[PDB]
Amino acid sequence: VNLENKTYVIMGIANKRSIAFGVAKVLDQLGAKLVFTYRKERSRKELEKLLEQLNQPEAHLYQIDVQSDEEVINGFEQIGKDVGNIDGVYHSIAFANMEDLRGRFSETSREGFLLAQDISSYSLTIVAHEAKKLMPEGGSIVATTYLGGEFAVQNYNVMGVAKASLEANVKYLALDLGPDNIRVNAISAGPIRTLSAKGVGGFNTILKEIEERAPLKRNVDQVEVGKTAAYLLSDLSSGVTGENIHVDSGFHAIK
Amino acid sequence: VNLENKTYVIMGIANKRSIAFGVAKVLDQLGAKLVFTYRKERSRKELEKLLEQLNQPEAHLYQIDVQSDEEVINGFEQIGKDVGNIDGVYHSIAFANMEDLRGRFSETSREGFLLAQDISSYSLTIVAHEAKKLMPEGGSIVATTYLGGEFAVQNYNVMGVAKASLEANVKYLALDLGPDNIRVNAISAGPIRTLSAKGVGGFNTILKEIEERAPLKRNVDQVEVGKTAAYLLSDLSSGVTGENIHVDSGFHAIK
Amino acid sequence: VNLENKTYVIMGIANKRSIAFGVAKVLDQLGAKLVFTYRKERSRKELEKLLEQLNQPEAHLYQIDVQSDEEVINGFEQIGKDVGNIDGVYHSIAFANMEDLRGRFSETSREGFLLAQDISSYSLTIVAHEAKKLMPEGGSIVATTYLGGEFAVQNYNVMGVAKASLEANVKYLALDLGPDNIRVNAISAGPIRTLSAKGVGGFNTILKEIEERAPLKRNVDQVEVGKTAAYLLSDLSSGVTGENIHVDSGFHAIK
Amino acid sequence: VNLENKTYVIMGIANKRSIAFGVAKVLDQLGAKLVFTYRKERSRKELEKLLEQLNQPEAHLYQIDVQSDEEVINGFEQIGKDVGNIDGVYHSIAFANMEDLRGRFSETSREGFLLAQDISSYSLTIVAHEAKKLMPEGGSIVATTYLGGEFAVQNYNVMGVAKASLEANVKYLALDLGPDNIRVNAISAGPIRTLSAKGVGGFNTILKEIEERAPLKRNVDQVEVGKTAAYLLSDLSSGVTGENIHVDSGFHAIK
Ligand SMILES: NC(=O)c1ccc[n+]([C@@H]2O[C@H](COP(=O)([O-])OP(=O)(O)OC[C@H]3O[C@@H](n4cnc5c(N)ncnc54)[C@H](OP(=O)(O)O)[C@@H]3O)[C@@H](O)[C@H]2O)c1
Ligand SMILES: NC(=O)c1ccc[n+]([C@@H]2O[C@H](COP(=O)([O-])OP(=O)(O)OC[C@H]3O[C@@H](n4cnc5c(N)ncnc54)[C@H](OP(=O)(O)O)[C@@H]3O)[C@@H](O)[C@H]2O)c1
Ligand SMILES: NC(=O)c1ccc[n+]([C@@H]2O[C@H](COP(=O)([O-])OP(=O)(O)OC[C@H]3O[C@@H](n4cnc5c(N)ncnc54)[C@H](OP(=O)(O)O)[C@@H]3O)[C@@H](O)[C@H]2O)c1
Ligand SMILES: NC(=O)c1ccc[n+]([C@@H]2O[C@H](COP(=O)([O-])OP(=O)(O)OC[C@H]3O[C@@H](n4cnc5c(N)ncnc54)[C@H](OP(=O)(O)O)[C@@H]3O)[C@@H](O)[C@H]2O)c1
Ligand SMILES: Cc1ccc(Oc2ccccc2)c(O)c1
Ligand SMILES: Cc1ccc(Oc2ccccc2)c(O)c1
Ligand SMILES: Cc1ccc(Oc2ccccc2)c(O)c1
Ligand SMILES: Cc1ccc(Oc2ccccc2)c(O)c1
Ligand SMILES: N[C@@H](CCC(=O)O)C(=O)O
Ligand SMILES: N[C@@H](CCC(=O)O)C(=O)O
Ligand SMILES: N[C@@H](CCC(=O)O)C(=O)O
Ligand SMILES: N[C@@H](CCC(=O)O)C(=O)O
């Protein structure tokens, strides 16, 4: 994976613990040029400090809230003008109201359910449609998911249904975009201590279970997700699309 | 499988070809009391005509548009007062705009995507929550899905992401309502000529492929979906929950 | 589901706790004629005793060790001569050495691995081939599997790989016999205290993990598997083949 | 992915079309030391000739017929004395009798069934057990499987059941070898013209179906499998075990 002269757009860095920052560090080590997208300024002022650790010679930062078509459209349009054609997108965006991530799934509000779907699933479709405009020779799109999209996990609740939806999103996009030579895949990350992970009910109990039961008997980290993102974003994975790669210490394969 | 002194709510009959009317003939044949819900006054009219084919001595009909919290909430509450406690719900409800059921999935609109999720997946969650109120003793809830929820199938597009969502919805509901003795399951029906089928591009091609490639080499019909629904709604399936049963001539198991 | 004038062959009753005896009580309650096959002379003796609590007017019992082609061939030929044509077969047969079962999977012996395949998987293929001659107009064949065929489960070792083989065997048989109108399916039973459970290390802790985690929060029993077998063996499941129905309180659906 | 100072054992090159020779070319290009195992004289001769395309400063060739324990034990032991500790194994070994790769599954002989299991699935267990001795520090083991192990595919028959078994073998090995920091994974390759493909009935038809229907609308090749093998054998995938990566142009995601 030498990624010199590759350009990747990385969506969803909030702080130094975000899974996308592990992705970022890894691609940065391999010589890629990185463009970053963020939702609010609390991530901008902060992103800017995090980018000091990378060897990125310049900060390419764009505000995009994936709840707005116009921000996704105008965003990717600006990126093309500032930076040219890209080679891929790392999508690491998700959201649910805290109230819907604990206690009873059956009590989920319509508003909260549709919000999770909007941000955590639909946002890949629109990102992919707009990013394709910048990948005329082909490219690669990767989304983060979690095992709770495939099994019912205590507490994860509405996010589990949004992830299930994201994983299908990835397959329907793989089928659509395949003839344009754009591969679309998911990385199912094991549990990692992030900002968003404070929102999930019973998180520490998740970590400990991994350590006890997963084949490798340890948890994974951001850099391990990034190393697999690197394979997926590069030519190493050229025959692989519509795939879900579990980077979770083997936990997915046991019961 | 005798269902005398059982009561089931069937959601989603629009005409004689509906999958839900297959369920109805089977449950009615086995002695159950049925309650029907519908959206369009056209569907109530068809129901009044089709009830003359059933053994149901009286017509129990409720207009419930599942897009309205109020209509579902007041619909079940009313059902409870008219017939008392129920034994299960057969959910056979789905919708997507025609624009979003052909050509390119990467071009799906936000509005088109959330609309399919709202009707086709979330409706199950809110229906279960209100139906739980009429099943103090336990009961059984069954929803209708398609293979396109598990694989990217051509043209099914926004509905496939909706069915993936529905199937996860079934697992999360299974987990949450299990301790209340309420089973939640899914029938994955093979292609059947219905009104809604008319909006799926390539639908004749799908039928023909079943005949040629599925293990049984024949299509299924609505009564066959009904017969598995009887199994799922009844004590026969008492240790079965969170499950997806493919009533599709074996098609899911081949490639 | 009424089964008068039907004839089913049941393989693998050793005693009252056997899963197949649960199948037998259910089919007997439903009016089926039953034929029983056994390996050890002790199982024939338990069978002559267990028959007293069934409605079967005649004991039809046949020694068939599935390690021997000639016993399977001669045994079904003789069944056809004594009772005529049959409507299906319940296969409830598996075996592995303690010595392979009990200690690291990577240390499994060739002879142990192949023995477990032979009895636990290949036996389905030869039985189906011989049973099909007694089903000129179609019928149904059900085999018993366990979740450890789909995931790596602690201690289940060589038998996990044999159940993975057995579930593939079901699909390949489904595809092959589908055009003769013979359906082939699997029941994934949850854990149940039987004579064979005593070969699974940590059985007690598996039982307890179901009660704590399975959506239904309780273990299943042999009758529950029999009620799902009745469904699969009867015309209720007519559009169902190549399927794997989990009768495990929803445990397959959670992580 | 720089593989200098790694040593890998590659099992099952027979000629220039073998999937393992695509693996070899990639690993060799990345700086790895390679050790090759073979069964037939003819294969050792092709290997001698194919080594001239590689940069291997020496030929490390070992006759290992995986039907014999003594050969696998003595093979790896010899390898350990000649090259020292290794970093992993690529397993590219399968076999079935021709008559078992076409026509009707139900007619498979016991001898042919167990022969396919022995060579194509059990071999991984014994090889893992022996290779583990040369990986005190950790390492990576990769097997080659086919989608026919997950679904029933016309003509693949007894090899479909042997791959179902291989894929479970990979999960059970992962669970067992995980605490020794040994990862075990599979690549599910799409169809590729090789010597062994000539035994798969309808092979050309399978290839055309990929071009027509798979997301990427083109077939894969041996080098593309080898690039994924590089990812699995290397530290890029340090968090990935018990996984099955489909290198098949997305065909696994579609129905
Ligand atoms: N950490 C884990 O254990 C874990 C495991 C498996 C999968 N995942 C997945 O990995 C991804 C990243 O989560 P994380 O753990 O890295 O947490 P994180 O650091 O909190 O990242 C979540 C990111 O999503 C962004 N986001 C939320 N709503 C957005 C919107 N409307 N528009 C644009 N961006 C928005 C957030 O930006 P703002 O803060 O600026 O709002 C934040 O950067 C998620 O998809 C998550 O589901 C996480
Ligand atoms: N035919 C197939 O090949 C096939 C295969 C697999 C799964 N299915 C599933 O089977 C289920 C039933 O569909 P079908 O083929 O039987 O078609 P159908 O006869 O057209 O039934 C669709 C039903 O959905 C109802 N519906 C739509 N939106 C609603 C809303 N907002 N509120 C309440 N009801 C609403 C419709 O009622 P109104 O007409 O009153 O609006 C109609 O009764 C669907 O979930 C579908 O996805 C169908
Ligand atoms: N119990 C569970 O929790 C559990 C869970 C999931 C799946 N299962 C499956 O359920 C099935 C029934 O097992 P069980 O638990 O009911 O235990 P069981 O009562 O001990 O029944 C096992 C049966 O296998 C028969 N058998 C073994 N080798 C045979 C051979 N070579 N030829 C003919 N018959 C042979 C035995 O017959 P003989 O006694 O005459 O030797 C015995 O009747 C098995 O396939 C098992 O894997 C069991
Ligand atoms: N081609 C495809 O479309 C495809 C797709 C998916 C998976 N696969 C898998 O890829 C792997 C490699 O096959 P291939 O297509 O590359 O064909 P191949 O070139 O013919 O290789 C098969 C190898 O298996 C070896 N082998 C067979 N029995 C053996 C034994 N008893 N002891 C040691 N080695 C033995 C053969 O060695 P000898 O010639 O010396 O006997 C040969 O080198 C197989 O597992 C196959 O199932 C192939
Ligand atoms: C285990 C886990 C932890 C954190 C996750 O990210 C979230 C969680 C809740 C809301 C938004 C993002 C996640 O997807 C999975
Ligand atoms: C094969 C098939 C046929 C009809 C279906 O029902 C729909 C389809 C699209 C929108 C609403 C209902 C379906 O889910 C699957
Ligand atoms: C949980 C469980 C318990 C018992 C089982 O049956 C066996 C196990 C080992 C050898 C023979 C039969 C089984 O398949 C699964
Ligand atoms: C599509 C395909 C083609 C070739 C294969 O390799 C075999 C096939 C039969 C016996 C030995 C090796 C295979 O596993 C899958
Ligand atoms: N043939 C139409 C629709 C098929 C139908 O449902 O009748 C199309 O492909 O657009
Ligand atoms: N529906 C039946 C039994 C279904 C179930 O097993 O929950 C009842 O109300 O008792
Ligand atoms: N407890 C014993 C036997 C298991 C059992 O069958 O309960 C073991 O784990 O070695
Ligand atoms: N298709 C022919 C030729 C074999 C092959 O394609 O490999 C067959 O039925 O065997």
Side-chain angles (χ1 to χ4, degrees), chain C residues 178-229:
Chain C
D180 306 302
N181 195 31
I182 293 159
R183 294 182 290 104
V184 185
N185 293 285
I187 299 187
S188 201
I192 298 166
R193 198 175 320 277
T194 67
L195 200 53
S196 293
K198 309 191 159 93
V200 185
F203 197 70
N204 283 339
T205 77
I206 292 178
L207 276 178
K208 138 158 135 289
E209 163 159 73
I210 304 311
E211 254 164 84
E212 293 169 359
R213 283 150 97 148
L216 292 197
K217 260 115 182 81
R218 64 161 178 86
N219 286 295
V220 294
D221 63 14
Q222 299 92 321
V223 167
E224 292 186 292
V225 174
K227 301 178 318 189
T228 291

Side-chain angles (χ1 to χ4, degrees), chain D residues 155-204:
Chain D
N155 301 311
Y156 198 58
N157 293 356
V158 73
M159 189 57 58
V161 179
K163 301 306 203 170
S165 171
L166 179 66
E167 287 169 38
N169 209 325
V170 163
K171 296 175 228 190
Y172 280 91
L173 285 172
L175 173 50
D176 179 30
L177 298 181
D180 304 300
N181 197 28
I182 296 165
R183 304 182 291 100
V184 187
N185 291 288
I187 297 159
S188 199
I192 289 156
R193 293 204 181 286
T194 64
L195 206 46
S196 283
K198 260 78 132 74
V200 174
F203 183 78
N204 291 336

